Every structure is written in structure tokens, then in C-alpha cells.
């Protein structure tokens, strides 16, 4: 809730990288279910979360 309020209203998708990383810190890695959760919390299509996870190397998909 603090992360999503660092960005202008109407641009919640800007929080994908922080939240998707916060998911990994809690869980140690990012399963497909973790990505789908961040998609619905931020209300962005799940594919747009898959793109970020696969693009960046600090996200562990295994």
C-alpha cells in the first residue's frame, strides 16, 4: 500500500517491479501463482507481469 502510493493515481502499473520483487523476498522465488497474484492486486493483465519477470535477471522463476 505504501509502494502503490509512490506513483500518480491512474498509474498503478508502475508498482509491478517493486511488488513483484516483494513477492520474491517473502517467498524466495516467483512461481506462476505469485505472478498472477501481483497481476490482480495491481489490475494489470497477467502477461504484462510475465514480461517483467522474464526480462529482469534478479527475478528467480525457479
Amino acid at each position: 500500500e505504501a509502494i502503490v502510493k509512490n506513483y500518480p493515481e491512474g498509474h498503478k502499473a508502475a508498482a509491478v517491479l517493486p511488488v513483484l520483487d516483494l513477492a520474491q523476498r517473502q517467498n524466495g522465488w516467483l512461481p506462476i501463482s505469485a505472478m498472477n497474484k501481483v497481476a490482480e492486486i495491481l489490475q494489470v493483465p497477467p502477461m504484462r507481469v510475465y514480461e517483467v519477470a522474464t526480462f529482469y535477471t534478479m527475478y528467480n522463476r525457479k
Binding site: 491512474g10 502499473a13 494489470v44 493483465p45 504484462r48 514480461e51
Partner: protein, 129 residues
């Protein structure tokens, strides 16, 4: 300036009798004057420059021996190219053919702005690149 005697003929040009076309393929045929549509699989527009005149498709059946595609239409493969619509109608009228003319369909100009992909308060913003 031509030092040769000329005459005046007020009748429309009609060569149907001096072309050798059987009457079946003058009166019963429907020419189609059109600019070919762009092949949608490709982005090139170099086949949409000239007018074409095609005729009405007729029966194609199966050769009993080999299964090939037989035909009894001598005009099945006839395609003529014209620079302008008027040149196409002029050629069909003097040959006695009945024609339909379809007006050219040019794609209307559009407003392309690469910056609209990153709009602050509009839906044109793209979710990915």
C-alpha cells in the same frame, strides 16, 4: 494541317462486328472494371496502381480422366490493364461488353504519433513495447 481528306462520323465507336468475338461472348458477358485490392498478406501497394478489367467467372468442372479443372470459357484468363478508369470504360464500350465499374478505394490518411504511446491521461498508452 493534315494534307489528307478527312470525314465526319457522329456515331459511337463500335467494333463488335470486326473483332471475331462470337456473339455469345459479347452480349452475355459482364466485364468488371476495378482497381485490384491490396493482397492483405503483404504491405506492398504496387499491385494497386492500375485499373483492371476481368470477366464473370463461369463453370469449371473435373476432367473424368485425371481430375483436372476443365473449362469452356475462352475468357476465363483474360485480364486487361488500363491507366485510368475512363480508358477502361472506353475499351469496354467499343467492344460491346456490359460492364460494372467500381471506384478506387484509397486508404484514407491517418494521424500517427509515436508519442501517443506514452500519454499521461489517455487510453492510447500502450501496456508493452
Amino acid at each position: 494541317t493534315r494534307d489528307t481528306q478527312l470525314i465526319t462520323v457522329d456515331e459511337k465507336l463500335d467494333i463488335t462486328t470486326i473483332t471475331g468475338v462470337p456473339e455469345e461472348h459479347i452480349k452475355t458477358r459482364k466485364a468488371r472494371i476495378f482497381v485490384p485490392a491490396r493482397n492483405n498478406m503483404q504491405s506492398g501497394v504496387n499491385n494497386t496502381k492500375k485499373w483492371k478489367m476481368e470477366f464473370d467467372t463461369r463453370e469449371r468442372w473435373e476432367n473424368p480422366l485425371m481430375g483436372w479443372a476443365s473449362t469452356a470459357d475462352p475468357l476465363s484468363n483474360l485480364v486487361l490493364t488500363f491507366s485510368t478508369k475512363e480508358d477502361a470504360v472506353a475499351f469496354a464500350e467499343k467492344n460491346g461488353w456490359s460492364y460494372d465499374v467500381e471506384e478506387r478505394k484509397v486508404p484514407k490518411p491517418k494521424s500517427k504519433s509515436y508519442g501517443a504511446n506514452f500519454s499521461w491521461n489517455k487510453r492510447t498508452r500502450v501496456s508493452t513495447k
